[PDB]
RNA sequence: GAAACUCUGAUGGAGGACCGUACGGGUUAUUGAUGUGCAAAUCAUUUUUCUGAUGUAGGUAAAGGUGCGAAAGACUCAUCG
RNA sequence: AAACAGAUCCAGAGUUAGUCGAUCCUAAUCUCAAUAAUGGGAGAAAGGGAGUACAGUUGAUAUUCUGUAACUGACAACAGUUCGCGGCAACGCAUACUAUUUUUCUCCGCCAAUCUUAUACCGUUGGUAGGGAUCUCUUUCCUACAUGACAGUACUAAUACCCAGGGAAACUGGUCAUCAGGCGAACUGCGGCGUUCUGCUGGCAAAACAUAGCUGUUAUGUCAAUGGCUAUUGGAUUGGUCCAUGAAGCGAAAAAUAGUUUACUGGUCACUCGUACCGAUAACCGCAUCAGGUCUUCUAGGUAAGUAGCCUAUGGCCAUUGAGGCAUGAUAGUUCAGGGAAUUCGGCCAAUUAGAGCUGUAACUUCGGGAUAAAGCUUGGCUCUGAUGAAAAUCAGAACCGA
């Protein structure tokens, strides 16, 4: 960056929109506890490598 | 063949100040070829009426008249209260903030 | 924006049906500058206060003219 | 000065010339500091080079009994008889 | 260490282009196809490459948005002009299209010198606006004094090259330097032409900035003169160097020879993808907010030969646990009577020397070097004088002064 391509683009879209927090309602929903979000990442630890 | 004025209706009533000081400083302490109290037609200095009528025949800056109007407000202990700035052109004022 | 000299040529070139306004401006050593919008330039004409009134007169009727 | 030419001063700006800068390229010495390091090779002072057989970037070529090597068995992703 | 802070955590929000890039062309190089062929495609976000500037605005975007002013290309009709002339010449001025061939621009190494715009900086001359300073002194000190792409046509004056006349040894003209000339020099033209230059405008004060006053806007003002021995950049005029001679292609224009001919000037639209921030100083690579490593850009004043070292405006900062002691020791530093390598494997280390100007320089030598050889001296401050330049600079000389 700049000057990303856009498909390049579009794997660092889906990587910053997939990094979050999971839902509240899941754990209420299936009762199951301790599900993290496995695609969630710091910028800085975990480089992507794409 | 220049004239300038500097304004001093409100310094003079409300502080210390007064013309006959004023004058007698800017007779001893305004200089031309860069010597003090040489004055023989080169400026007059005056008060008439309820300014300061300083008048040039030899070639005399309006900024000579700032400098040393400047120096005399520190001099009384009139710094931050009036202050020396432009009317109009050969004009100075002594306005207050 | 190109300057014209002729106050001749200036009314040869505001009555072309491009122009869509006239700007009257006063100037430095009491002139006035009619500048003509064209689509393409802004022609500029400099004149003096002799003949400052006829000019304003000799202006299209339909074309809109606007003073500062 | 008979001549062939050769004395003085300026002009000129040649050279894998010289001194000397760097967030340049190298890495001599103190066998200094560090050696439970800032660092799986660093730091300080000193030293070498600085228009060149120069440094450097991107793209591109050469692949494991091969490659490449101003040759140390060097280097080929902290790995190399 | 602490923490209400944070590049941490959580929730939302943010990247606007016909002109900047990619896209298009080829380079080193790679890969298919045909041989009834003589190629096609890939390959550069530093090469080639048509075209943009200012001002304003947001909590984050801007040459992308808004305002204002340009410019380039493609596709349409339509209105008005026009059916080739000037100069002895260099050349000037309003003229088509298809094809073939030929040529040019694009277009090119490195080094050195001279001249000159722009920008920065320092200057002599003044000035006016505001602010800083004041026991005394300082008509002082600081800030400000500005105009974009783009378009025009004056005469000043340049150098390159060409043209007309001119017709050169008693050789003349010319550079910092080499040099130029009967294959036509000096020299004259209010010659020709290209590139730079000065002035005057348009853009343009309506904007922007600084003061003063009123509750959003009204006032004045942004001025006049003229140097650089300073630097960087763009360009011009040249030289030197090589057993080194320093891209291609797309594209564009021109010319010649055929053939077909009337031409020129003056609404709409411009797709696609990138655009935030860091760029090491905590955002990249080193397992990490690692004293390491990694390509480039804009580059102020003083001292000085200086892009050194040292000090300071603009800009950015206090990155770094605190409170108290100070013996010993480790480490980085100044200094040490007398001696001066006796220390030690060894002058390792540190000390001495040093810049500049004026003297003065040996053996030996491949005659170029050695050589800054070695060895001596002088250097401040203050008041002056003289020489060389255009020049506000630089060099020489003399007084007087005290640790």
Not at chain 2, 38 to 58: F, H, P, R
Not at chain 2, 65 to 75: D, G, Q, S
Not at chain 3, 20 to 25: A, F, G, R, S, T
């Amino acid at each position: 960056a700049a000057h990303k391509t856009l498909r390049t683009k579009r794997i660092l879209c889906k990587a910053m929109k997939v990094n979050r927090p999971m839902p509240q309602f899941i754990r209420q929903m299936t009762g199951v506890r301790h599900i993290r979000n496995p695609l969630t990442r710091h910028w800085r630890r975990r480089k992507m490598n794409i | 063949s220049s004239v300038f004025y500097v304004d001093c209706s409100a310094p003079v009533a409300d502080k210390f100040f007064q013309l006959q000081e004023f004058v007698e400083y800017l007779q001893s302490h305004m200089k031309v070829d860069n010597l003090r109290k040489n004055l023989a037609n080169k400026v007059t200095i005056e008060a008439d009426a309820g300014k300061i009528v300083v008048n040039a025949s030899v070639k005399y800056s309006k900024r000579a008249v700032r400098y040393y109007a400047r120096k005399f407000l520190a001099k009384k202990d009139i710094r931050s209260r009036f202050h020396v700035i432009a009317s109009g052109k050969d004009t100075y004022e002594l306005r207050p903030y | 924006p190109k300057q014209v000299t002729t106050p001749k040529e200036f009314l040869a070139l505001a009555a072309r049906s491009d122009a869509k306004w006239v700007k009257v401006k006063k100037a430095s050593d009491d002139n006035t500058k009619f500048k003509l919008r064209t689509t393409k330039y802004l022609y500029t004409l400099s004149v003096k206060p002799k003949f400052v009134e006829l000019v304003q007169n000799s202006i299209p009727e339909s074309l809109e003219v606007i003073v500062l």
